[model samples]
Target: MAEAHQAVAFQFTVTPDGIDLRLSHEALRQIYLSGLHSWKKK
Candidate 1:
């Protein structure tokens, strides 16, 4: 996760065997942002 957050931005390559769950910067950012909103709402 740390490696991804500090990345310069790139696309992901899934293994197609439930062995990977990587995501792009925009996707990860959306998740983190949404999580923050959830925390605030709670």
Candidate 2:
């Protein structure tokens, strides 16, 4: 069997002050759950 693909992926950028957070759209969707569907403004 093949390895399962990751549901989410992340990236980091280190700076002198601190690190920056970065993630894939899939990750954002997973985190927000229902929010993803209502992301647009009225």
Candidate 3:
């Protein structure tokens, strides 16, 4: 569970690489939604 947040943080940190910015944008949004859902359920 905690790892999920860490993963997103890592993605953001790496996004400055240029190419990953585009990919991470979509992935981060999806992960944010999923994380919100799980957090609400908990």
Candidate 4:
């Protein structure tokens, strides 16, 4: 059997400081859990 990595894909933006993100439900959940209050406008 051939070894393989799971299909977890991400899009990357290259710049002075690079950024990468995956279009995923878990990512959205993490963002909401981590920063929902801070993200709300006063």
Candidate 5:
């Protein structure tokens, strides 16, 4: 599905003190392991 590529390609930037992405680092690891390798959830 087209949405899958969008998911994989998604990128973002955030300050540690502000509204970060809803997903926590642990959750991000799940998706990253699944396929979303480009998301720098570090």
Candidate 6:
């Protein structure tokens, strides 16, 4: 098994804020039941 934080296998950068990551179908269901494609805006 892998640590939750270390589970993110890829590294990236997004200017001015952060980069968007692509999650697998199963991973999305594991983390969040719904709204898997959207992020909360501050």
Tell me the TM-score of each prediction against the true structure: 0.45, 0.38, 0.40, 0.34, 0.31, 0.26
Clashes of each: 0, 0, 0, 0, 0, 0
Write down the lDDT that model 6 would get: 0.59
Q: Select the stronger candidate by lDDT from 2 and 4.
A: 2
Error of 2 at 6 (Å): 2.0
In the range 1-42, model 5's lDDT, one tens digit per residue, is: 455444554435588776443544555667767676556464
lDDT values of the candidates?
0.67, 0.69, 0.60, 0.57, 0.56, 0.59
Mark the regions of model 1 whose C-alpha exceeds 4 Å error after superposition.
1-18
Candidate 1, after superposition: displacement of residue 21 in Å? 3.5
By summed lDDT, the worst window of 10 consecutive residues in model 4 runs over 1-10
Root-mean-square deviation of candidate 5: 9.5
Error of 3 at 8 (Å): 16
Tens-digit lDDT track of model 4 for 1-42: 432222442355667777655465655676676697777776
> What alpha-carbon RMSD in Å does predicted model 6 have with respect to the real structure?
8.6
Residues 1-42, model 6: lDDT tens digits:
877655774446576776776555566566674455456543
Task: Quote the RMSD, in angstroms, for model 4.
Answer: 7.8
Per-residue lDDT over 1-42 for candidate 2, one digit per residue giving the tens place of the 0 to 100 score = 442236336778999999998777777667786676679565
**What's the distance in Å from true for residue 20, model 2?**
4.5
lDDT of 3 by residue, 1-42 (tens): 456544554333344555443244657788889989987955
lDDT for each residue of candidate 1 in 1-42, tens digit (9 for 90 to 100)? 477455644455567674545566687787889899988956
**What residue pairs are clashing in model 3?**
none
Off by over 4 Å in 4: 1-10, 13-22, 37-42
Q: Which stretches of candidate 5 lie over 4 Å from their true place?
A: 1-21, 36-42
Highest lDDT: which candidate? 2
Total clashes for model 6: 0
Every model: Cα RMSD to truth: 7.1, 5.7, 7.9, 7.8, 9.5, 8.6
